[PDB]
Amino acid sequence: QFPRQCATVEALRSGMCCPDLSPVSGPGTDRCGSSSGRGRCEAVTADSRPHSPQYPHDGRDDREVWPLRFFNRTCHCNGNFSGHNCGTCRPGWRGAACDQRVLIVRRNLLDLSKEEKNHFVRALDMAKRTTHPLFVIATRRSEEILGPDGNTPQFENISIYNYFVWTHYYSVKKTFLGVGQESFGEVDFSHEGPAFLTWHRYHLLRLEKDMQEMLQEPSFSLPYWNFATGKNVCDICTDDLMGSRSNFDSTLISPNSVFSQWRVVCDSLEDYDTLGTLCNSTEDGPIRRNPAGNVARPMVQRLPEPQDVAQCLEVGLFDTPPFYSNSTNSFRNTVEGYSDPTGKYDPAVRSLHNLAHLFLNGTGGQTHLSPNDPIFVLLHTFTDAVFDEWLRRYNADISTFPLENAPIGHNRQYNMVPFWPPVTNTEMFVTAPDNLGYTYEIQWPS
Ligand SMILES: *[C@@H]1O[C@H](CO[C@@H]2O[C@@H](C)[C@@H](O)[C@@H](O)[C@@H]2O)[C@@H](O[C@@H]2O[C@H](CO)[C@@H](O)[C@H](O)[C@H]2NC(C)=O)[C@H](O)[C@H]1NC(C)=O
Ligand SMILES: *[C@@H]1O[C@H](CO)[C@@H](O[C@@H]2O[C@H](CO)[C@@H](O)[C@H](O)[C@H]2NC(C)=O)[C@H](O)[C@H]1NC(C)=O
Ligand SMILES: *[C@@H]1O[C@H](CO)[C@@H](O[C@@H]2O[C@H](CO)[C@@H](O)[C@H](O)[C@H]2NC(C)=O)[C@H](O)[C@H]1NC(C)=O
Numbered sequence: 001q002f003p004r005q006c007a008t009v010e011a012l013r014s015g016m017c018c019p020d021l022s023p024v025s026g027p028g029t030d031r032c033g034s035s036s037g038r039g040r041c042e043a044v045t046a047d048s049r050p051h052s053p054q055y056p057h058d059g060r061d062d063r064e065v066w067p068l069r070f071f072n073r074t075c076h077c078n079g080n081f082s083g084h085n086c087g088t089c090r091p092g093w094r095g096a097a098c099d100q101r102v103l104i105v106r107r108n109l110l111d112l113s114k115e116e117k118n119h120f121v122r123a124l125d126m127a128k129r130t131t132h133p134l135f136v137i138a139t140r141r142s143e144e145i146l147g148p149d150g151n152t153p154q155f156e157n158i159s160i161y162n163y164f165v166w167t168h169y170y171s172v173k174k175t176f177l178g179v180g181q182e183s184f185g186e187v188d189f190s191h192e193g194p195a196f197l198t199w200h201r202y203h204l205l206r207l208e209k210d211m212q213e214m215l216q217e218p219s220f221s222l223p224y225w226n227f228a229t230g231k232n233v234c235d236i237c238t239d240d241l242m243g244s245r246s247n248f249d250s251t252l253i254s255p256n257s258v259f260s261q262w263r264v265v266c267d268s269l270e271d272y273d274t275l276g277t278l279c280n281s282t283e284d285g286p287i288r289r290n291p292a293g294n295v296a297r298p299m300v301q302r303l304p305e306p307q308d309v310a311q312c313l314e315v316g317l318f319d320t321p322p323f324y325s326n327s328t329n330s331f332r333n334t335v336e337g338y339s340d341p342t343g344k345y346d347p348a349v350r351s352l353h354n355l356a357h358l359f360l361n362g363t364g365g366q367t368h369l370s371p372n373d374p375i376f377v378l379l380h381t382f383t384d385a386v387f388d389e390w391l392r393r394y395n396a397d398i399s400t401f402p403l404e405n406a407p408i409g410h411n412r413q414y415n416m417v418p419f420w421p422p423v424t425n426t427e428m429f430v431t432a433p434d435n436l437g438y439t440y441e442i443q444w445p446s
């Protein structure tokens with residue numbers, strides 16, 4: 001969603017989201033930091049190439065050709081400057097001139113020290129309570145975004161971590177067709193398509209960045225959870241980490257973990273998909289988590305085996321037609337978990353990433369809701385670690401990431417929805433240590 005400077009009547013009317021950086025001569029005098037050389041307000045590029053025939057409602061959904069339904073001009077920054085303002089630096093760069101290299105290391109959560117484990121847990125908790133300094137979220141779609149009286153932007157403040165939940169929600173929600181009509185659900189701007197891995201990579205980079213600024217610790221890094229152990233249990237679900245099971249309710253988190261106090265956002269689908277509203281910042285209800293608990297679905301009662309990871313990393317093409325959840329021999333569909341680890345499609349199979357979600361048999365395994373469970377962060381840095389090893393191993397071969405006829409949202413040059421500033425899948429399709437300022441301390445099975 002959008003910088004608070006752009007969630008106004010004026011900015012949405014002008015179609016321009018190009019905020020000032022240091023307005024020393026008055027408002028509008030330093031848009032995108034043009035006073036210095038940091039950037040310039042510029043026309044948006046959005047993907048205009050066709051998508052797969054599965055989405056038939058072109059013209060109906062604000063996520064199409066993102067961000068054009070809200071803004072057609074944004075800040076484009078020069079050099080290694082970056083941000084909605086061009087006021088910060090691109091990943092891997094710090095300093096006023098964006099010329100100092102940083103490399104942060106994402107490590108296995110179980111390898112952290114007693115203190116490092118405690119620091120991480122409290123930092124997640126701080127992000128859950130701390131208002132995001134920059135972004136606000138919409139509670140209405142574009143037709144109602146200026147509110148009933150036409151002068152009241154329908155945006156809410158939201159915490160650093162709940163923004164992380166909301167953007168995942170917004171990417172997966174159904175297309176609203178109107179009161180009385182059933183919303184359309186064969187659409188997903190962050191799953192079931194090639195954008196899945198790059199979407200989720202930016203997802204993590206933006207949370208990590210937000211927490212660095214919240215903590216004022218430039219080197220803070222999100223750890224990972226090696227869920228590919230074949231285990232029957234959740235080895236990070238302990239009270240010094242992500243929280244153990246409640247002895248008073250098998251589906252709740254131990255009261256001796258702060259995460260039992262969290263309350264989730266976006267759990268009112270029945271309202272959103274009938275009234276046409278969007279998830280707002282009001283929390284409601286605790287995290288439900290029940291590892292291995294899906295007795296009705298035995299396939300999701302055990303986690304992935306180690307070799308599952310070693311096998312999926314031998315799939316050498318990033319994606320294959322039809323670039324969807326039923327692709328075969330697609331690395332993306334394999335690690336996403338709709339193929340078996342060799343790449344062989346099967347409508348039944350759930351493996352790796354999908355399996356790790358469903359193993360939680362709770363909030364973490366529901367599509368509109370799953371970042372509400374903070375295991376999500378660690379589940380996806382590990383998924384991102386596998387992706388990064390693939391990028392290393394096959395020379396970041398983006399050729400099979402399709403430029404057209406992908407499911408809507410997944411064309412290569414699509415701006416990933418709804419991140420801001422606009423950022424394409426291509427911008428994330430790079431090896432992380434040289435291009436994004438982070439690397440993984442990890443070892444792979446042979
Ligand atoms: C760039 O956008 C302006 C502003 O319009 C907004 O932009 C989009 C997000 C879309 O949602 C528009 O409906 C928004 O109003 C465009 O100028 C407006 O054009 C409309 C007709 O299309 C007109 O009724 C308004 O008066 C115009 N507003 C202003 C301030 O002139 C502009 O045409 C767009 N330029 C492009 C796409 O190149
Ligand atoms: C993958 O699933 C898709 C969508 O369910 C199937 O693709 C086509 O879908 C269009 C409408 O989107 C229909 O005309 C057909 O059902 C599909 N085209 C065919 C069968 O030629 C597709 O069949 C699936 N791919 C597989 C199973 O390999
Ligand atoms: C924030 O979201 C909640 C959940 O959708 C909204 O509360 C619902 O509002 C509908 C109709 O207004 C009621 O029928 C439901 O019973 C409400 N749910 C709950 C849990 O109270 C709430 O109105 C939204 N806030 C804003 C400002 O839109």
Ligand SMILES: *[C@@H]1O[C@H](CO)[C@@H](O[C@@H]2O[C@H](CO)[C@@H](O)[C@H](O)[C@H]2NC(C)=O)[C@H](O)[C@H]1NC(C)=O
Pocket residue numbers: 290293294295296297360361362363365366
């Ligand atoms: C957690 O697992 C239970 C089953 O172990 C799920 O409940 C089952 O849901 C299916 C499909 O909705 C029903 O056919 C079964 O009758 C249910 N069984 C029981 C014992 O409840 C539950 O939906 C799962 N929850 C999540 C979030 O995954």
Ligand SMILES: *[C@@H]1O[C@H](CO[C@@H]2O[C@@H](C)[C@@H](O)[C@@H](O)[C@@H]2O)[C@@H](O)[C@H](O)[C@H]1NC(C)=O
Pocket residue numbers: 004131132133136155156157
């Ligand atoms: C959102 O909240 C605004 C508060 O602005 C600032 O936000 C963070 C950084 C906190 O430090 C807070 O204390 C600050 O004041 C309010 O002005 C307003 O209620 C909200 N604005 C909108 C558009 O919803």
Ligand SMILES: O=c1cccccc1O
Pocket residue numbers: 191353354357358364365366367368370
């Ligand atoms: O976001 C998800 C939520 C629930 C289950 C499986 C896979 C997901 O990516």
Ligand SMILES: [Zn+2]
Pocket residue numbers: 168191367370
């Ligand atoms: Zn997801």
Ligand SMILES: [Zn+2]
Pocket residue numbers: 353357380
């Ligand atoms: Zn996921």
